[PDB]
């Protein structure tokens, strides 16, 4: 039931500054008023984050995704390698009431979109392996970090109320762990899902790299500040 649209979704591929966003808790250990140095995959400070205003993008080691969402236009995500029945494919959808995660060899169309009047962007769904249902994930800045290490799919999330006009604010906010998946797929590309009525969406994408960070834990165990040990001599 999927048909290619007439107009091209040619979104301007702009660039902007990451500033000091993209920090998440690396483990589940409580620490109180201490400085801890750890080496892991992070988003480098003051990096170059790509702005889209629906192409297939590489996954690399991990992905940082951000959206100044209004009225919940973004709906889900697709992950895979060949994006067909030849390989297992991951699908995540956040409809009005629940979130559904599926691991199946779907047959996606050339332009998937959720449609309005539940899932019809795939011609077939066979050999399903993993299913999951949970509470909904979602002026409203939504930040997510997706990682895939040794057959484990980690998703970190954060929601923020913002009043700034255009770009990412200058501030610090750590990302708390959200979901873990014990499934092994060698994901290499991914795609964004929109539910556009049959008749102007902006988001930001950045990539992770391995490096060392220093984090500060206050009395209550919350991360309030961080330092990148490879930015400039003062930081080192």
């Amino acid at each position: 039931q999927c048909v290619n649209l007439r107009t091209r979704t040619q979104l301007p591929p702009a660039y902007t500054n990451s500033f000091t966003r993209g920090v998440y808790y690396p483990d589940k250990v409580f620490r109180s008023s201490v400085l801890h140095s750890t080496q892991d995959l992070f988003l480098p400070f003051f990096s170059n984050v790509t702005w889209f205003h629906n192409p297939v993008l590489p996954f690399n080691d991990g992905v940082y995704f951000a959206s100044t969402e209004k009225s919940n236009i973004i709906r889900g995500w697709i992950f895979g390698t060949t994006l067909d029945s030849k390989t297992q494919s991951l699908l995540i959808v956040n409809n009005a009431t629940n979130v559904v995660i599926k691991v199946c060899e779907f047959q996606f169309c050339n332009d998937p979109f959720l449609d309005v009047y539940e899932s019809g962007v795939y011609s077939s769904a066979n050999n399903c392996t993993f299913e999951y249902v949970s509470q909904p994930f979602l002026k409203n800045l939504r930040e997510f970090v997706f990682k895939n290490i040794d057959g484990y799919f980690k998703i970190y999330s954060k929601h923020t109320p913002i009043n700034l006009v255009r770009d990412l604010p200058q501030g610090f906010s750590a990302l708390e762990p959200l979901v873990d998946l014990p499934i092994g797929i060698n994901i290499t590309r991914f795609q964004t899902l929109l539910a556009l009525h049959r008749s102007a969406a902006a988001y930001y994408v950045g990539y992770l790299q391995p490096r060392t960070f220093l984090l500060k834990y206050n009395e209550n165990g919350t991360i309030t500040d961080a330092v990148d040990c490879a930015l400039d001599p003062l930081s080192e």
């Binding site: 808790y25 589940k28 250990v29 409580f30 620490r31 109180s32 201490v34 392996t129 993993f130 057959g151 484990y152 708390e176 762990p177 014990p182 499934i183 092994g184 209550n220 165990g221 919350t222």
Partner: protein, 366 residues
């Protein structure tokens, strides 16, 4: 003192002999409430089973499976485990399970085994000689067998080749025994490969229907998700014991704590990577760990040439858990520890044998 010093005479002074520590009392283990049981009931208690040549295949993953009830129940006529002993299933586990269920005759029970041949073993279901898993079989004469004959169940008898391991063939094509071609009509050299079971309540033991389910456990590199529940027990406090909190093992005394774990941490450490607090997976409360007491012991003596009575000092140990020198004489608790075998006096003289914190002892008794 004599043995440590390796001499038969000892001069006046204080000597360090050995150490002292509090032994743990008992063990405790804690684990989550256990949920998401595997659905064995819908498989074994299924109202209708499929035929042997169309065996039902079921995939089991991401659940907890209890084989204790299956092993203990005597309702199963045949319980044959080949890969491992039944008692060890609850300990180690694989990444997925496959269940193949069907109904056969009572005599064909041994055909479902590694390195076995027969009509079933070569035309309906095949097991590799390296297969690992278990087989369960139980009579169903009162249910599967029909007074008019359970002709619904069919078995394949005719095929040019055998069946591969875990391979199912359901072709209804007319088998051609000879070289004479047939236009879909059975003749002298053409026959239907499938024939019906003829179960009746009065047929005899061996011909009675038997429901058979084989379980195969596979360990693909994906993380394991299905195996037995983890046993747990209650918890104690104010006693040096050893614990296995959700895979984190260690000794110490557990007390109540006022720390505020943020809602997703599990355990806390302060510095130098030493655990201080934990959260029990059932009550979801924050506890506190303290190492139970230990310290060195020392002996104060005035010299073998003078006398033969001594005093004993435990360093940095509160005079609450000392334990023949458990009561002995009057016990004195000092800033340096606890002391047994000497009397505290209100006078003050010069220092003979230093003890610590501004106090010392001498021989007068001691």
């Amino acid at each position: 003192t004599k043995c440590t010093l390796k001499s038969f005479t000892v001069e006046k002074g204080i000597y360090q002999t050995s150490n002292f520590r509090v032994q743990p009392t008992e063990s405790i283990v804690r684990f989550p409430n256990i949920t998401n049981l595997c659905p064995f009931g819908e498989v074994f208690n299924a109202t209708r089973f499929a035929s042997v040549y169309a065996w039902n295949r079921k995939r089991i993953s991401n659940c907890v499976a209890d084989y204790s009830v299956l092993y203990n129940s005597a309702s199963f006529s045949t319980f044959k485990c080949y890969g491992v002993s039944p008692t060890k299933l609850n300990d180690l586990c694989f990444t997925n399970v496959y269940a193949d269920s069907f109904v056969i005759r009572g005599d064909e029970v041994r055909q479902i085994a590694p390195g076995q041949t027969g009509k079933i073993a070569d035309y309906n279901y095949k097991l590799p000689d390296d297969f690992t898993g278990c087989v369960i079989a139980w009579n169903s004469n009162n249910l599967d067998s029909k007074v008019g004959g359970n002709y619904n169940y069919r078995y394949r008898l005719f095929r040019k080749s055998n069946l591969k391991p875990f391979e199912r063939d359901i072709s209804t094509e007319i088998y051609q025994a000879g070289s004479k071609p047939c236009n879909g009509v059975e003749g002298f050299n053409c026959y239907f490969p499938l024939q019906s079971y003829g179960f009746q309540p009065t047929n005899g033991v061996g011909y009675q229907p038997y429901r058979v389910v084989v379980l195969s456990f596979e360990l693909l590199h994906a993380p394991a998700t299905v195996c037995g529940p983890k046993k747990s027990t209650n918890l104690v406090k104010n006693k040096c014991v050893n614990f296995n909190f959700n895979g984190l093992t260690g000794t110490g005394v557990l007390t109540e704590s006022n720390k505020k774990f943020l809602p997703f941490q599990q355990f806390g450490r302060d510095i130098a990577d030493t655990t201080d607090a934990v959260r029990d997976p059932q009550t979801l409360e924050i506890l506190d760990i303290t190492p139970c007491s230990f310290g060195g012991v020392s002996v104060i003596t005035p010299g073998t040439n003078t006398s033969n009575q001594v005093a004993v000092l435990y360093q940095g140990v509160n005079c609450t858990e000392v334990p023949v020198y458990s009561t002995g004489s009057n016990v004195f608790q000092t800033r340096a520890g606890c002391l047994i075998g000497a009397e505290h006096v209100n006078n003050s003289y010069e220092c003979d044998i230093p003890i610590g914190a501004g106090i010392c002892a001498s021989y007068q008794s001691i």
